[PDB]
Amino acid sequence: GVPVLNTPGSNQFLTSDDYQSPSAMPQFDETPEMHIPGEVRNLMEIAEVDSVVPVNNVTGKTKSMDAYQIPVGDKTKPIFSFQMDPGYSSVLKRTLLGEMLNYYAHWSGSVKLTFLFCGSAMATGKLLISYSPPGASVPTSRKDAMLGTHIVWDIGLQSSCVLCVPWISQSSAGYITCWYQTNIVVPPGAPTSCDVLCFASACNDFSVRLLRDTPFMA
Amino acid sequence: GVPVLNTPGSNQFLTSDDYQSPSAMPQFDETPEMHIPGEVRNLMEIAEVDSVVPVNNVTGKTKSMDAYQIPVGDKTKPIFSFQMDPGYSSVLKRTLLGEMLNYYAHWSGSVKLTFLFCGSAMATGKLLISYSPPGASVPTSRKDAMLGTHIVWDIGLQSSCVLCVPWISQSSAGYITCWYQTNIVVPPGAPTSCDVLCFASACNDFSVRLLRDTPFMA
Amino acid sequence: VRSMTLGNSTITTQNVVVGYGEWPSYLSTAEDQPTQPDVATCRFYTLESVQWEKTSPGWWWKFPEALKNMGLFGQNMHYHYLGRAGYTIHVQCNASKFHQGCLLVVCVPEAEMGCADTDTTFPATELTTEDTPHVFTSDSITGKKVQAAVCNAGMGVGVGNLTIFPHQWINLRTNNSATIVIPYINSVPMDNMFRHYNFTLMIIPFAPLNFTDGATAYVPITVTIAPMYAEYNGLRLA
Amino acid sequence: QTRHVVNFHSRSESTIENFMGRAACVFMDQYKINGEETSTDRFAVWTINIREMAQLRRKCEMFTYMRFDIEMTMVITSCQMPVLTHQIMYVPPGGPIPAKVDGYEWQTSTNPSVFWTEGNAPPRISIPFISVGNAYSSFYDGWSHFTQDGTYGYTTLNAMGKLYIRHVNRSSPHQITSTIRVYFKPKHIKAWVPRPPRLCPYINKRDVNFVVTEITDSRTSITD
Amino acid sequence: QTRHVVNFHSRSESTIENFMGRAACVFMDQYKINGEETSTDRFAVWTINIREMAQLRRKCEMFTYMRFDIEMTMVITSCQMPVLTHQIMYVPPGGPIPAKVDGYEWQTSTNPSVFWTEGNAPPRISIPFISVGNAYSSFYDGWSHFTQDGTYGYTTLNAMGKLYIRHVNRSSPHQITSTIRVYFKPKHIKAWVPRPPRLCPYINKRDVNFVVTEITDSRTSITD
User: Shortest CB distance from C31 goes to which of A135, A151, A166?
Assistant: First the structure.
């Protein structure tokens, strides 16, 4: 018949191949596919969902829901501060964003942060959310944070301020610090201490390349 | 199914084959190609670049930069002289030309030589650059070099004389000798002794066939 | 005679070797957005003049960080951790008519140099002293520093066939000025300007300087760099 | 390492088929050839389920519902003769199982089986979407027996079958101990209803029980 | 020999793909099968890099930047039984490595591996352009750690992966010592920025350090 010759690589088993497997049940006709709501057709559709970020993950507040609560209400030290990289960062590593990114080695994109102020409807104050570029040093004072990139987020007007942090990739990252511009002004009836929740997702579109095994499972 | 029969040469590993290798990472999509300046698309684009030729490679002047300098400034013996073959010649074997030709066994083409006079702007003289055909004997005198092929290169007018030596191939070569037509005439202010640099590349186009391993590496 | 000016820096010049036949250009995404300074940065940064005697073996500068203390370029290196530029490099020699010599002005992208005594490394301050050049040596040297012997410039190659790179000869018989344009050769569109040395301007005298007992005992070589099309990362939010 | 400009735009590696469709070894097991005519150590079993090893189970638990063909390729070795021939019998969910290496179930026409002899390429057997329902369910918040009886969380829809493996050689002069490595691979996979990733370590291979684990790794203060 | 008329006009052998794309043996190594359950002599490593042997390294140093697929074919022998089956596991740059022959890393689904049994054609595994940047850099005049720290000349962009190789057979009655010969081959190769050839001999496989060598071989006078 047809003169063939076997190349190197014949009769081997490469684990990652896409060959036509001989079906064991050829007569068998499988169940018709009904429409089930909520189909996933790409993994980065999970990273685009906001989810609460445990910023207050100090040594004794990680097995309770006090990890997600940023206490608001000393103006010389910032409220909170954390590395801006969903990998190798205690704050952003178990987020939906930060968890679908540990399956991969090469990823690059932007990340948006939402700060939901969960205080009273009568509490009013200002917070200054500064961003440091990935090479720059953190601001040690509020003035030095004001001279860089910032957003004076008035709580009394809007209760949710959204960022979009670019240049986020691995293959020395940014900082999202927050400062007391003003204290929390409160009438006699409302409580004095409030909380701020944080969120994180992919801002516009996210790029991600090399699949690997996750470090978390043992 | 299809009646096939294996030919002689099946299930062997020929080192030099061009078969479709089964890709180990099929899902993986590689990085897009940006434009990087200075692409090489043929090796003979390296041989066409001029480069300085160590003509004065005498026994104690090869680990310094006195190898590249031809001292100018006795009219009975020539200034310099060397075999005209980029292979198996001490002068032209480590040139870009002579080094991209030791990767190959069969090569044939022409070679151009540029003599840059690196003396003063006031020094003036004549040099007679003779060429012997690959079968002929070297000229023993200046007159016998004048009766063959030569170019009386006036230094005071032009400071760079270009040759193009044909019939250069291997699979008993020419000679580029140089003679004092006149001595170097110099005013009282300028120095008396000058230097001449040499260059070598492929003249128009170069032919080269059989790849091999280089002798230099051990 | 053309009197070039860029910004607030004017030099006086007397043919351009465009490196690899390309002129530098900008990178043209909202996920990563470059900032184009344009203002300043592009002015001429004239380094310290270098005296070339009869016994000078050569010099080298390592860019982009040779300009790390040079005004706004040198200051934008500290605020942005990514960047790219083009670096038009003028090299005059303003010798006399009775001096003789010849220079190789070559740029050598990615000049990874070797230590003087192998089996060890060098303390990182031996490759570069910002503005001032590290000279070569005429023979072999030892110690924890760069093997700076000519005939094996820095990389273990022959110094004669260093002409493969963007080069220009300065033969004092004919000309005195050189100009090279190096359109940012790198494998990544942007890179940090303190870790990576994109190219190594090295000036190597092939034919040595010579003169008589009346002339000046040296020839000052003037180096001028104009960072063109410098662009950096973005510092603003999106 | 250093932070480089990772400049590219691609999500073809993040699709479901390029995320789940990867062959992973899910079953090592030993089985002899001779001796102990009534023994359970002369064949292998491995009831096919996604809850085999935690690394792949974690990926299957990203999604509530998923349907996919499976294409497993066994890698069979031997230790210590003639040339050996093996049998990898896949029984469907509705199928009789052998009790001994010499049971009559091995000869059932409705149980497809490959007869791989040693030395060739590894045997590959492909199984379609068997389940009764319209997808395999990774999680089942329900009870198998009506009126809240025992066996929580186990539905019979996500039953895939079993994989009985033996030597077909009746005997041998000496002892031969074969080792099999089943390489499971989802194929033509669709997935519905995304789900947050597993946080706590796994306890047992048939339940979702866990020990309360911290959310993230702790740091010193809120501002460092 | 004699000087003949070498008359022809061709430069198809001087192109980059016809100059670099040639298979060369770059890694011999031994690895046993049994004994010393915690030993490093039961598997091979070979971190993939172009700076393996000087003959090919010299060719890669003609050019500053180059990108290329690699297609290596192993040639595995054995000495001293059953029929042997091997495993050649390629781990990507971001990938876990085994510490022992019986580590869990060997079962990682993201590390592709071939299972070649003895007697067939040699196993061939192809790896695409992995690097983060847009080309592999032969030379890197820079520092890995910012602010001029240690480790000169090593960038992480030109990381290609590793190649862990073992027997899949758990044990053997006697000792079997297998030898593997990895045949590296660049494929679909492009190259940028030409560079002068190496003059001095190589010292070490991770640096460019050298001893000052003469330019050319010396002759007696300038005129002979």
Answer: A166
Q: How distant, in Å, are the alpha carbons of A29, B67, B89, B138, B147 from that of B179?
A: 94, 19, 21, 12, 13
* Structural contact between residues E61 and E90, judged by C-beta atoms closer than 8 angstroms: no
Length of chain A: 218
Query: What is the bridge-based pairing of β-strands A160-162 and A107-117?
Result: antiparallel
Domains of chain D with CATH codes: 1-224 (2.60.120.20)
Cα–Cα distance measured from residue A24 to residue B79, given in angstroms and rounded to the nearest whole number:
86
Nearest to C183 by CA among A10, B162, B38, B21: B38
Experimentally, the structure was elucidated by: cryo-EM
Chain E residue closest to D5 (CA)? E133
Residues C148, C150: Cα–Cα separation, whole Å: 6
E195's CB contacts (< 8 A; 6+ apart) are C157, C164, C165, E61, E62, E63, E64, E138, E139
Pick the closest to residue C89 from C142, C11, C147 (CA basis).
Answer: C11
Kindly write down the DSSP assignment for every residue of D140-186, as one continuous string. --SBSSTTT-S-BT--STT---EEEEEE-----SS---EEEEEEE-E
Spell out the residues 6+ positions from residue E211 whose beta carbon is closer than 8 angstroms to its own. C118, C140, E200, E201, E203
**Tokens 């380094």, residue?**
C47
Alpha-carbon gap, residue E175 to E158, rounded angstroms: 38
Q: Does residue E127 contact residue E114 with C-beta atoms inside 8 Å?
A: no
* C79, C192, C237: residue with CB nearest A164: C237
The reply to whether omega before A22 is within 30° of 0 (cis) is no
Q: Alpha-carbon distance B155 to B152, whole Å?
A: 9
CA distance C87 to C44: 10
Minimum-distance CB partner of B189 among C98, C160, C210: C98
Tokens 């073959």 label which residue?
B85
CATH number at residue C235: 2.60.120.20
Q: What is the resolution of this structure in A?
A: 3.8
DSSP character for C76? H
Whether the CB of C208 is below 8 Å from some CB of chain B: the reply is yes
Contacts 24+ apart (CB under 8 A), E25-29: E25/E181, E25/E182, E25/E183, E25/E184, E26/E52, E26/E53, E26/E56, E26/E182, E26/E183, E26/E184, E27/E52, E27/E163, E27/E180, E27/E181, E27/E182, E27/E184, E28/E179, E28/E180, E28/E181, E29/E165, E29/E179, E29/E180
Chain A hits for C192, Cβ within 8 Å? 135
The single-letter DSSP state of residue D109 is T
Distance from CA of A8 to the nearest CA of B (A): 6
* Residue D9 at interface with chain C, using a CB cutoff of 8 Å: yes
Annotated binding residue at C169?
no
Q: Is E30 helix (H, G, I), strand (E, B) or coil?
A: strand
Tell whether D8 is within 8 A of chain B (Cβ): yes
Q: Which of D3, D5, D9 sits opposite C189 (nearest CB)?
A: D5
Domain count within chain C: 1
Q: Which domains does chain A have, with CATH numbers?
A: 1-218 (2.60.120.20)
Tell whether E164 is within 8 A of chain A (Cβ): no
For C100, half-sphere exposure in the C-beta direction (CA atoms, 13 angstrom radius) is: 24
The letter for the amino acid at D7 is: N
Q: In this structure, are strands C178-181 and C17-18 parallel, antiparallel, or unpaired?
A: parallel
Question: Is C206 touching B (CB cutoff 8 A)?
Answer: yes
C214 touches chain B (CB under 8 A): yes
Round to the nearest angstrom and report the end-to-end CA distance of chain C: 48
**Other beta carbons within 10 Å of D1:** 13
Within 10 A of A69 (CB to CB), how many other CB atoms are there?
19
Would you state the structure tokens that stand for residue B27, as one six-digit string? Answer: 């899902």
A82: closest CA of chain D, how far (Å): 7
Q: Which residue has the tokens 């060369």?
A: E24
- Domain extent, residue C1, equals 1-238
